[PDB]
Design a protein around this nucleic acid. Structure first.
Ligand SMILES: [Mg+2]
Ligand SMILES: [Mg+2]
Ligand SMILES: [Mg+2]
Ligand SMILES: [Mg+2]
Ligand SMILES: [Mg+2]
Ligand SMILES: [Mg+2]
Ligand SMILES: [Mg+2]
Ligand SMILES: [Mg+2]
Ligand SMILES: [Mg+2]
Ligand SMILES: [Mg+2]
Ligand SMILES: [Mg+2]
Ligand SMILES: [Mg+2]
Ligand SMILES: [Mg+2]
Ligand SMILES: [Mg+2]
Ligand SMILES: [Mg+2]
Ligand SMILES: [Mg+2]
Ligand SMILES: [Mg+2]
Ligand SMILES: [Mg+2]
Ligand SMILES: [Mg+2]
Ligand SMILES: [Mg+2]
Ligand SMILES: [Mg+2]
Ligand SMILES: [Mg+2]
Ligand SMILES: [Mg+2]
Ligand SMILES: [Mg+2]
Ligand SMILES: [Mg+2]
Ligand SMILES: [Mg+2]
Ligand SMILES: [Mg+2]
Ligand SMILES: [Mg+2]
Ligand SMILES: [Mg+2]
Ligand SMILES: [Mg+2]
Ligand SMILES: [Mg+2]
Ligand SMILES: [Mg+2]
Ligand SMILES: [Mg+2]
Ligand SMILES: [Mg+2]
Ligand SMILES: [Mg+2]
Ligand SMILES: [Mg+2]
Ligand SMILES: [Mg+2]
Ligand SMILES: [Mg+2]
Ligand SMILES: [Mg+2]
Ligand SMILES: [Mg+2]
Ligand SMILES: [Mg+2]
Ligand SMILES: [Mg+2]
Ligand SMILES: [Mg+2]
Ligand SMILES: [Mg+2]
Ligand SMILES: [Mg+2]
Ligand SMILES: [Mg+2]
Ligand SMILES: [Mg+2]
Ligand SMILES: [Mg+2]
Ligand SMILES: [Mg+2]
Ligand SMILES: [Mg+2]
Ligand SMILES: [Mg+2]
Ligand SMILES: [Mg+2]
Ligand SMILES: [Mg+2]
Ligand SMILES: [Mg+2]
Ligand SMILES: [Mg+2]
Ligand SMILES: [Mg+2]
Ligand SMILES: [Mg+2]
Ligand SMILES: [Mg+2]
Ligand SMILES: [Mg+2]
Ligand SMILES: [Mg+2]
Ligand SMILES: [Mg+2]
Lengths: 118, 146, 65, 204
RNA sequence: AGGUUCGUGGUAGGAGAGCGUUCUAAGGGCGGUGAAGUCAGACCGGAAGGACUGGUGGAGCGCUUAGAAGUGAGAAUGCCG
RNA sequence: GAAAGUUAUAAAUGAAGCGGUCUGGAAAGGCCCGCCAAAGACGGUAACAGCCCGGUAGUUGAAAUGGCUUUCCCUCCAGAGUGGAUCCUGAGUACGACGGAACACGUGAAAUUCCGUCGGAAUCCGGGAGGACCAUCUCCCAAGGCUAAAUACUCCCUAGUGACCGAUAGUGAACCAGUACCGUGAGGGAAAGGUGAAAAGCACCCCGGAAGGGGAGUGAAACAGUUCCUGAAACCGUGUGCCUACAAGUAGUUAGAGCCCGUUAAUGGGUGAUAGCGUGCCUUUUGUAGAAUGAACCGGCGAGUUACGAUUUGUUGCAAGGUUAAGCGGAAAAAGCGGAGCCGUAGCGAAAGCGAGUCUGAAUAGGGCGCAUAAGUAACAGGUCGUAGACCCGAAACCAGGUGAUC
């Protein structure tokens, strides 16, 4: 029996054209360019989902370094002292303390100075 | 069984393979044919015995023999099969046909001598091998030729 | 239509009791002064079709040589 | 075995059936294969489409091979053209096939025994009607509590059963030799006359 | 069914399990208190995909188990509009 | 040439619910009750009808013409033996030489048949064939003619069927289709279906020359108004929430303030100043963002299929056995019948032949192939192969019948 191709092609193409909403010009209207746009967006998201962690770690390190320079310490010396004393606070929480509770950051820096000189 | 719950035997039916329906199935663009050859063309390929110009194997070895017009082939009956008969029975080619152990007689019935017999029987057939005759008179029976 | 038997190779091969194919040696026609007696003795026997050629000529002798 | 009963609903005694026919352990896979075989041989298979060699027209090359700027084309009825011919499509063809005789006999035995294993088989001593009358047959069917699709097997006399039951929807009458795997499977209950039981048993 | 260990980049290519479309058979269904189609949504599944609600539409269409194929398009200086 | 019968070409009769109630423009639908049925096929009727209509099952019917069958009429007709003296039984033929053709058979050891040219018999004490040819045997009488049935096909007619299509499909043609159009001519050859149940197809008023609109009216619906069911995408516009005139952009993704909303309610939606990263898709290539190829965009159509054989894997039935083909039977069924045949149970040898062995060979030797060491067959399904266009599109060219000197 003949199987004419109705209702199945448009249903599939409209999903992609809806996924490409918000793009410039014909990239949100025409199927052929919207398909390429959607594939490229998926690939970009996949790669940036790995680069995001790298970016945030860089930001935390920069903030910790800036806060530690005010206590006559480098970032390198502070991290070495914290590792030598036995403190296992990651960069995220150290950066949080630096941004807000700076008193606690200064206490931790005192601990690192004590362990480093020792 | 009810027609709304038919289930054929598992492993007896399989799904056909269709080539050229997208790259996700592994048989997409080129459809299992490769790239740009003679074997990749519609209706392509060479003869069954072709070797690309090298002389075919059958053409570098000689022919041998002839065919006899008067060739004779016999239906073969062995001794072990012949043990299925109550002894003291005159075994005949027509009886061998009627019992169903010989389907068609080709040019006569010839009996061979592998296996063993233990029954006193009288057997007539077109031809006998030497050892078959020896075995038949060994058990006490008699052989006669038709 | 049923497929035809290759008549040329139906005059050269033989089907043995295990389904293999048996052939004849092929240097035995007209230059017997140029080959030794050992070679001629060994060329007058029969050989068997190897696996590589069998893979190629099954279909074309499929019905009794 | 079973209980013979009269066509008015009253019990008529007892009847025993051969165990080599109605008592075997049914082979379901064989029944399924035979059902598929019998259903596949009922279809006409009359269908046909036109290739590019049967569509009217063609022959002339639409335009030159080179220099015109258009694609290379060779006929007006090529498969990719609008009014062109179909590539493969359907073709007149038979679908019937048939499987070994002993398999079919085993299948009929198995499906005929499966009815008894589920108490879906009714044996009655006789079944006759003076004149064709669908009202009488409907009253009969109501009396013997069937209330579903049924198949009636009558052997030799039957007076006129086919006429007096031709109008009911899920009711079929066969003359005790036309018994089939597919026909038995199609209907729910199986009413079989006593005289038909001997014929069915002796045939198989 | 539960564990231990070793694995899980991939072109040509080999093997396996599936989604969806049209028709047929049986069972069971819904529909002028609104079917198919179409439009919009921030829902569900590992993918192909599947629901629910609302607008238009105004008469047919699903589901389960099997079977048969004119079986799924983004490209051919492809054909027609 | 009659008589009778039957059949084909018009037709007649033909059972049973206006049942109550709900929704609705309308009931054939839902609920509750009944009835007919040798009639529950199909179609229509304001939505899906066995009981409203045409009808259907069954039973009847023919003035006229055609067809078929029996009977009568009419017409025409010798067939058995016993004898062999003599006579008859297809002449420029049967064959042969030369040159071709048909026979599965390509001149070959080439029988058999036919054609053209030459030569050219016997005739019952005779002649021909049995794959050159001779002898024996067996079968048969050429050179004259006729012959039904079993077989092939379907422009048509009557009755039906489809796991066939449904307006780019199915005939080129569902519509005034071989038409319009193209060509000197032969010739080539399209596009184009749908208001509504019923025209009830918009009286009348207003703007305008008209077309076309806004009310009013018919209608269930006019956002159904004479390409009129549904009405997608490209494409063209009107309004508005967020952003935008110091900014080097395969146009996105990740981080992210501000502003505006409020969902299939869940670590929600829209827009996004600013920052990091980032050279489209396909083909062909050692290698392509490629300044190599293809695509203006959207929609529809567009490519491994079927028939018959071979081989291999899976499933099922039987098992040293397995299985029928054509055909009879029948409902385009299912049994039953049909054992002709095919594969397997024994191999070796070129062959005579021998045979669990056989061949080579002087051989009881050695060696090759086999047995010891044994499971096949029928059907279905998947993979691959062969013959067919064989996976889809594309040449320049070749041959055959015709149409052209209005240039
Ligand atoms: Mg269809
Ligand atoms: Mg399509
Ligand atoms: Mg944006
Ligand atoms: Mg598959
Ligand atoms: Mg691959
Ligand atoms: Mg592709
Ligand atoms: Mg290629
Ligand atoms: Mg290749
Ligand atoms: Mg042999
Ligand atoms: Mg020689
Ligand atoms: Mg043509
Ligand atoms: Mg041509
Ligand atoms: Mg067509
Ligand atoms: Mg992998
Ligand atoms: Mg890995
Ligand atoms: Mg594969
Ligand atoms: Mg409702
Ligand atoms: Mg209402
Ligand atoms: Mg549909
Ligand atoms: Mg809807
Ligand atoms: Mg579904
Ligand atoms: Mg297709
Ligand atoms: Mg396109
Ligand atoms: Mg165009
Ligand atoms: Mg009437
Ligand atoms: Mg009436
Ligand atoms: Mg009302
Ligand atoms: Mg009603
Ligand atoms: Mg009506
Ligand atoms: Mg309606
Ligand atoms: Mg209607
Ligand atoms: Mg004569
Ligand atoms: Mg002659
Ligand atoms: Mg000659
Ligand atoms: Mg003679
Ligand atoms: Mg002969
Ligand atoms: Mg001879
Ligand atoms: Mg004659
Ligand atoms: Mg349409
Ligand atoms: Mg058309
Ligand atoms: Mg003209
Ligand atoms: Mg209309
Ligand atoms: Mg007006
Ligand atoms: Mg008006
Ligand atoms: Mg109005
Ligand atoms: Mg009104
Ligand atoms: Mg309508
Ligand atoms: Mg419209
Ligand atoms: Mg639109
Ligand atoms: Mg500046
Ligand atoms: Mg600015
Ligand atoms: Mg950016
Ligand atoms: Mg290069
Ligand atoms: Mg460029
Ligand atoms: Mg190129
Ligand atoms: Mg281009
Ligand atoms: Mg088996
Ligand atoms: Mg038999
Ligand atoms: Mg030996
Ligand atoms: Mg192929
Ligand atoms: Mg002329």
């Amino acid at each position: 029996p003949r199987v004419k191709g109705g209702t199945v092609t448009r249903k599939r193409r409209k999903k992609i054209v809806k996924l490409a909403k918000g793009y410039y010009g014909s990239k949100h209207l025409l199927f052929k360019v919207a398909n390429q746009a959607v594939m490229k967006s998926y690939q970009y998201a996949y790669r940036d989902r790995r680069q995001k962690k790298r970016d945030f770690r860089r930001l935390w390190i920069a903030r910790i370094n800036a806060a530690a320079r005010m206590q006559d310490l480098s970032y390198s010396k502070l991290m070495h002292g914290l590792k030598l004393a036995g403190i296992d606070i990651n960069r995220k929480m150290l950066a949080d303390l630096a941004v807000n509770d700076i008193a606690s950051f200064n206490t931790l820096a005192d601990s690192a100075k004590k362990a480093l000189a020792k | 069984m009810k027609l709304h719950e038919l289930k054929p035997s598992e492993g007896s039916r399989k799904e056909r393979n269709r080539v050229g329906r997208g790259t996700g199935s592994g048989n997409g663009k080129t459809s299992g044919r490769g790239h740009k050859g003679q074997k990749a063309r519609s209706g392509g390929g060479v003869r069954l015995g072709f070797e690309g110009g090298q002389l075919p194997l059958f053409r570098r070895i000689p022919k041998r023999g002839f065919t006899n017009i008067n060739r004779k082939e016999f239906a073969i009956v062995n001794l072990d099969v012949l043990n299925r008969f109550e002894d003291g029975t005159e075994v005949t080619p027509e009886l061998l046909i009627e019992t169903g152990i010989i389907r068609n007689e080709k040019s006569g019935i010839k009996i061979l001598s592998d296996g063993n017999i233990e029954k006193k029987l009288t057997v007539k057939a077109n031809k006998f091998s030497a050892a078959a005759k020896e075995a038949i008179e060994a058990a006490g029976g008699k052989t006669e030729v038709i | 239509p049923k497929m035809k038997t290759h008549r040329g190779s139906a005059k050269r091969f033989k089907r043995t009791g295990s389904g293999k194919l048996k052939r004849r040696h092929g240097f035995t026609s007209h230059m017997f002064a140029n080959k030794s007696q050992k070679q001629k003795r060994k060329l007058r026997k029969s050989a068997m079709v190897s696996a590589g050629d069998f893979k190629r000529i099954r279909q074309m002798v499929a019905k009794m040589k | 075995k079973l209980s013979l009963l009269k066509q008015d609903g009253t019990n008529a005694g007892e009847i025993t059936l051969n165990d080599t026919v109605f008592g075997i352990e049914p082979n379901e896979k064989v029944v399924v294969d035979v059902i598929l075989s019998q259903r596949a041989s009922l279809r006409q298979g009359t269908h046909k489409v036109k290739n590019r060699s049967e569509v009217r027209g063609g022959g002339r090359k639409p335009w030159r091979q080179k220099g015109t700027g258009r694609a290379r084309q060779g006929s007006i009825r090529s498969p990719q053209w609008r009014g062109g011919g179909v590539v493969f499509g359907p073709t007149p063809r038979s679908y019937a096939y048939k499987l070994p005789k002993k398999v079919r006999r085993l299948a009929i035995k198995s499906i005929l025994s499966s009815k008894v294993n589920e108490e879906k088989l009714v044996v009655l001593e006789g079944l006759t009607f003076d004149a064709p009358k669908t009202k009488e047959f409907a009253a009969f069917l109501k009396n013997i509590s069937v209330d579903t699709k049924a198949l009636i097997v009558v052997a030799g006399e039957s007076e006129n059963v086919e006429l007096s039951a031709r109008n009911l929807q899920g009711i079929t009458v066969i003359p005790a030799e036309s018994i089939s795997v597919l026909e038995v499977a199609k209907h729910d209950k199986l009413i079989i006359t006593k005289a038909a039981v001997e014929k069915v048993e002796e045939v198989l």
